[PDB]
Ligand SMILES: O=C(O)CCCC[C@@H]1SC[C@@H]2NC(=O)N[C@@H]21
């Protein structure tokens with residue numbers, strides 16, 4: 180049920196495909212930040228989830244470079260898929276920008292995105 | 298200078314190839330936790346980093362499921378590559394385990410790994 | 415604006431007094447984890463926020479030790495107060511448990527809590 | 533012990549006092565960022581740690597307003613005190629800046645500071 184087009188609360192668009200090999204592949208389009216149009220994404224999910232009610236662990240990465248623009252940053256979303264009526268992906272994320280060593284302390288933003296298909 | 302074998306301070310070994318597209322492909326062997334043997338990794342990196350002296354931003358993910366076991370969890374490392382004599386990959390990570398939604402508040406461990414050649 | 419009772423989506427209850435000086439004092443009661451009854455909180459807030467409509471920065475810490483129970487752990491919430499329609503305090507938090515050195519890699523949980531007056 | 537003068541890897545000076553009541557009080561002086569001189573800090577720590585070799589959980593907060601300037605931001609450090617050998621304090625921290633609603637996704641930085649007495 181992961182495979183599909185999802186939207187973040189931010190309004191960003193997350194198009195993903197979950198392979199039977201546990202792969203995640205698609206594109207990301209951010210509603211905010213130093214970004215434009217779509218960015219490639221790759222990640223991994225648990226292809227054989229617990230059957231107890233547990234969500235499905237997954238993660239994916241976006242390097243914020245594409246054909247038009249390079250923010251010299253990468254975001255990784257770590258989280259889980261939750262099934263049901265209104266399936267959601269609840270994540271937390273780390274957005275690291277390349278920095279000088281002096282500035283590494285402020286290299287990384289953290290936050291949380293929730294994704295629905297609506 | 299990212300492609301090859303990297304070693305975290307925990308003892309873990311990260312084996313990776315960086316493709317010109319911006320792909321990261323490889324395998325991770327954890328020294329800790331619910332883990333055994335090698336695990337597939339996939340991620341992205343900035344193929345065209347800045348020149349002012351900035352590291353190369355990258356991130357990758359491991360779903361802790363392989364031939365030998367399934368821990369029902371995944372880790373994303375987000376951070377940057379810093380070249381030079383003692384190159385490093387300096388990361389922060391998020392490890393999300395699948396939980397009931399009642400337990401989702403404690404789903405996610407945060408930490409940091411420094412990798413070296 | 416900050417002084418008073420606030421409620422976590424989780425169910426937890428947070429009572430604070432914001433000192434003119436920038437002090438945060440009060441109690442926290444968790445709806446989850448190794449916790450029982452109320453715990454002391456202390457923290458700091460920006461007592462001179464900007465006037466552009468920007469939220470008010472603040473933070474607080476709870477060590478999960480009280481007269482009843484001790485989890486050997488601590489949580490810090492970092493975030494901002496937003497006033498208006500429905501005032502809110504939006505946060506992210508870090509919960510660190512005491513661990514041996516060999517288990518330090520798994521010492522800390524990360525999440526987010528949004529608080530409201532109702 | 534936790535009381536004393538601590539130095540982060542960053543060069544920052546952490547001057548803290550751990551009370552009997554489990555309070556953390558003192559001043560923080562960052563070597564980096566939109567800050568100068570000393571800022572009040574306040575926090576909590578576990579006054580009754582385990583005795584299995586487990587570290588000591590604690591955390592504190594700094595609002596980055598003082599008499600010289602106001603960054604409209606606050607950091608919280610969450611971590612644990614590790615005694616014996618080169619005693620040290622290992623933390624992760626969250627730095628939230630007051631922002632509009634639109635800009636809240638980039639309001640929070642995250643990192644890790646290790647403190648030693650050297
Ligand atoms: O500004 C950059 O460095 C690149 C744009 C990053 C946008 C971030 S990634 C986390 C969050 N979720 C989104 O959909 N957008 C923001």
Ligand SMILES: O=C(O)CCCC[C@@H]1SC[C@@H]2NC(=O)N[C@@H]21
Pocket residue numbers: 305307309310326327328329330331332361368370371372390392408410519
């Ligand atoms: O326990 C699990 O759920 C799977 C193995 C977890 C290993 C973690 S990922 C973060 C940290 N860095 C490592 O090299 N290993 C641990």
Ligand SMILES: O=C(O)CCCC[C@@H]1SC[C@@H]2NC(=O)N[C@@H]21
Pocket residue numbers: 402422424426427443444445446447448449478485486487488489507509511525527
């Ligand atoms: O289990 C412990 O060690 C104590 C944890 C207390 C509850 C946590 S703190 C972060 C989150 N927000 C809450 O209101 N409760 C949980």
Ligand SMILES: O=C(O)CCCC[C@@H]1SC[C@@H]2NC(=O)N[C@@H]21
Pocket residue numbers: 284540542544545561562563564565566567596603605606607625627645
């Ligand atoms: O820039 C600001 O908003 C205030 C300065 C913040 C300095 C940060 S707090 C985390 C890190 N550790 C330090 O000692 N300094 C930086």
